[PDB]
Amino acid sequence: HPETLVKVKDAEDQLGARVGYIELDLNSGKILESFRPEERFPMMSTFKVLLCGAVLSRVDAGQEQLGRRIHYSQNDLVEYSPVTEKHLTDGMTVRELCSAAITMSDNTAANLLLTTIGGPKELTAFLHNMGDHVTRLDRWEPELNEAIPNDERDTTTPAAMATTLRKLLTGELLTLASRQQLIDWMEADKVAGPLLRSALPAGWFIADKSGAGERGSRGIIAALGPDGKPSRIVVNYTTGSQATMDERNRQIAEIGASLIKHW
Numbered sequence: 001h002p003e004t005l006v007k008v009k010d011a012e013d014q015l016g017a018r019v020g021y022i023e024l025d026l027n028s029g030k031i032l033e034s035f036r037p038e039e040r041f042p043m044m045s046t047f048k049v050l051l052c053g054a055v056l057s058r059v060d061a062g063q064e065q066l067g068r069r070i071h072y073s074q075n076d077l078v079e080y081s082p083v084t085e086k087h088l089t090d091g092m093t094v095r096e097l098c099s100a101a102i103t104m105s106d107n108t109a110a111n112l113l114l115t116t117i118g119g120p121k122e123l124t125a126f127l128h129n130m131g132d133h134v135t136r137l138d139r140w141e142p143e144l145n146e147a148i149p150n151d152e153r154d155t156t157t158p159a160a161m162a163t164t165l166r167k168l169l170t171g172e173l174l175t176l177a178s179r180q181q182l183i184d185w186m187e188a189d190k191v192a193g194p195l196l197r198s199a200l201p202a203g204w205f206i207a208d209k210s211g212a213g214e215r216g217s218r219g220i221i222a223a224l225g226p227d228g229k230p231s232r233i234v235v236n237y238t239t240g241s242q243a244t245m246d247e248r249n250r251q252i253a254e255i256g257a258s259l260i261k262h263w
């Protein structure tokens with residue numbers, strides 16, 4: 001809806017920074033609404049959904065098991081590792097690592113999962129063989145959040161991400177079980193509170209994954225809808241602003257309020 005794009009134009013002018021935005025119908029797959037859809041934005045933690053999609057593709061093929069246990073050392077711990085820091089002795093299963101990566105944005109969980117699939121280049125190869133030849137991962141956590149302006153490393157476009165998310169969620173690649181698992185993780189996201197969820201009515205379904213990094217970078221990808229069922233995928237990034245994380249949150253939330261109002 002036009003009013004939602006005013007809000008994106010609002011946010012962009014207020015934050016003084018680029019903002020990309022996609023509304024995508026989950027059923028027909030048709031773009032409902034767009035803004036800077038072909039510009040690149042840092043993915044930040046929003047990559048962890050694609051990472052687990054790749055892990056789950058390996059699980060589907062028997063190259064990986066969700067119950068396999070991974071042990072690690074304290075030296076492998078990087079910044080912000082709420083769950084993985086607590087299991088140095090007993091390790092974690094691949095399922096537990098994807099749960100921590102998606103629901104809590106656990107950084108060490110991401111790197112460990114990246115090692116299982118063969119690194120960022122292997123994740124980019126996965127996305128490439130999915131029809132996404134735009135999205136790329138180059139670095140590990142936490143260096144992938146550097147968000148250097150015009151740096152194409154660790155970036156995606158709003159249109160590439162929304163399409164990739166739709167295929168991961170409602171495509172034919174992953175098995176029906178792996179698709180339900182990936183969205184289950186997104187639905188139990190514990191670190192996206194003040195964003196899209198804040199403008200969301202009771203009874204609505206939402207599964208998401210947010211990101212934040214350097215140089216005013218903030219974002220969110222989400223599959224949401226009323227009556228307990230998802231019906232649209234929405235993508236929103238921003239980068240460059242000197243604004244606080246609080247004002248970034250409140251901008252994404254306002255655009256979300258207009259999206260909801262105009263459903």
Ligand SMILES: [Xe]
Pocket residue numbers: 011015019237238248251252
């Ligand atoms: Xe934004």
Ligand SMILES: [Xe]
Pocket residue numbers: 196220234235236252253255256
């Ligand atoms: Xe949003």
